């Protein structure tokens, strides 16, 4: 629910497009480097009672993000389901184990 995380999402996605444009492989990408350093700033009036005021500062930061290819990686499986999902799906009639279908490799004789 954090705003920062959303910003980093936009960044991740864009750098991912870039890294695929550079010829790398999506599935073996990993964040090599994420840092953030202070950027520009804007200011705002806060008017306080009895003729006082202060300047609210609207802050903004620069973000640096590096995706690197790592062949050795193995990803933890996210395709596991809670027991509840399993047998609810069973009662619905859905198969709890997804269908694999053998697909013949693409070949050109013409």
């Amino acid at each position: 629910l954090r705003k920062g995380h959303q910003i980093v999402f936009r960044a991740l996605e864009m750098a991912q497009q870039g890294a695929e444009a550079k010829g790398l492989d999506k599935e073996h990408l990993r964040v090599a480097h994420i840092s953030c350093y202070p950027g520009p700033t804007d200011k705002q009036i806060d008017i306080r009672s009895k003729g006082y005021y202060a300047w609210k500062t609207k802050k903004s930061s620069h973000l640096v993000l590096t995706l690197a290819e790592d062949p050795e990686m193995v990803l933890p499986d996210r395709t596991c389901l809670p027991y509840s999902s399993l047998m609810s799906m069973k009662r619905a009639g859905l198969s709890a184990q997804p269908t694999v279908i053998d697909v013949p490799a693409i070949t050109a004789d013409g």
Binding site: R78, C80, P82
Partner: peptide
């Protein structure tokens, strides 16, 4: 913690 929705294929918290 999360898994893939068997329907949506989206990431999900149970």
């Amino acid at each position: 913690e999360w898994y893939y929705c068997p329907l949506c294929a989206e990431p999900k918290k149970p």
